[PDB]
Specification:
Largest sheet: none
Distance between the termini: 69 Å
Order of helices and strands: HHHHHHHHHHHHHHHHHHHHHHHHHHH
Structural class: mainly alpha
Number of strands: 0
Helix content: 55-70%
Length: 343
RNA sequence: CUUGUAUAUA
């Protein structure tokens, strides 16, 4: 097409492309041009493009390059224009949220439209909550709905999740949604999610996706509800019972690190006490089967040892530091990092 | 062991 050739080989404006706007949106270079202009163009030039491609808004939403232009009409468009797009999305929320490129439009839309329009569209997913969470695209729409709409207006999300909370916490996308529900949810909503997890802590810590859900609970302050305090303690105790093993684990090691980093004075000392040498003599002559030496030699546990040095109390730090120094004398990047940070 | 984990468009 002539106008597209005039663009790439050379400047034009939105008034010059009145005949072929829809053609411009679907092309890559033609789209990036329209995105650029919509940010700076006056209302008149924006209306001209809009009133031309308004009928093909759904098709463009789904488009590889056209979806950006519809996004820009939410970001830079007028109230009347935003309302027109919303009216086209009604009855199509399930479909659009599943589409690879249209879900990006739905997510952008939720950020810019008014509170009443956000819930109105999201209510169309009230019966497909589990479907959407498990979807590669639809979970991001759910995540966005939680972030943009108050939980008190979204009772259908958690109520459709009761009984599936442990399964989703070990799922790729579900763990992202659970974290979001714990963040934006009320005291009662956090209760309902953690009740279904307070029985399976060892499994979550060692899981490839669950350990992130654990890590999120670990980095919560004591300012939160009564449940969050109890569950945090359960995690610390569980890690305290298996300090050596968890630190030698690929996924669980990160949980140990977060435990000694965000845990309270008492909680932190409980974990270290399982590793700490008994006195000055034990630290100087450690056996190869002691907690310290089993951790320093390990590929994952050495980071926990490194993490211990930083967060340790004057008395505890004194015993750990000299224990590492003793290991260097008897005998990789793991030992290089411990070496220098001691010196 | 130049050392260790999860989000989808040009």
């Amino acid at each position: 097409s002539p106008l597209l050739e005039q663009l790439r080989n050379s400047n034009m404006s939105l008034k010059d492309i009145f005949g072929h706007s829809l053609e411009f949106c679907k092309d890559q270079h033609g789209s990036r041009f329209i995105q650029r202009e919509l940010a700076t163009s006056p209302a008149s030039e924006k209306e001209v493009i809009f009133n031309e491609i308004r009928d093909d808004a759904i098709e463009l939403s789904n488009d590889v390059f056209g979806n950006y232009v519809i996004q820009k009409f939410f970001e830079f468009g007028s109230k009347i224009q935003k309302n027109t797009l919303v009216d086209q999305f009604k009855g199509n929320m399930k479909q659009l949220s599943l589409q690879m490129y249209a879900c990006r439009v739905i997510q952008k839309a939720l950020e810019y439209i008014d509170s009443n329009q956000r819930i109105e569209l999201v209510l169309e997913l009230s019966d497909s909550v589990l479907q959407m969470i498990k979807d590669q695209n639809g979970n991001h729409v759910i995540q966005k709905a939680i972030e943009t709409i108050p939980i008190e207006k979204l009772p259908f999300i958690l109520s459709s999740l009761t009984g599936h909370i442990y399964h989703l916490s070990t799922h790729s996308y579900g763990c992202r949604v659970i974290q979001r529900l714990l963040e934006f949810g009320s005291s009662e909503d956090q209760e309902s999610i953690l009740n279904e997890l307070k029985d399976f802590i060892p499994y979550l810590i060692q899981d490839q996706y669950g350990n992130y859900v654990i890590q999120y609970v670990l980095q919560q302050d004591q300012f939160t509800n009564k449940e969050m305090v109890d569950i945090k303690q359960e995690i610390i105790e569980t890690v305290a019972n298996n300090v050596v093993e968890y630190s030698k684990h690929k996924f669980a090691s990160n949980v140990v690190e977060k435990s000694i980093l965000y845990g309270s004075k008492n909680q932190k000392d409980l974990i270290i006490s399982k590793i700490l040498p008994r006195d000055k003599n034990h630290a100087l002559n450690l056996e190869d089967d002691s907690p310290m030496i089993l951790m320093i030699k390990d590929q994952f546990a050495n980071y926990v040892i490194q993490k211990l040095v930083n967060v340790s109390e004057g008395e505890g730090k004194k015993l750990i530091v000299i224990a590492i120094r003793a290991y260097l004398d008897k005998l990789l990047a793991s030992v290089e990092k411990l070496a220098a940070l001691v010196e």
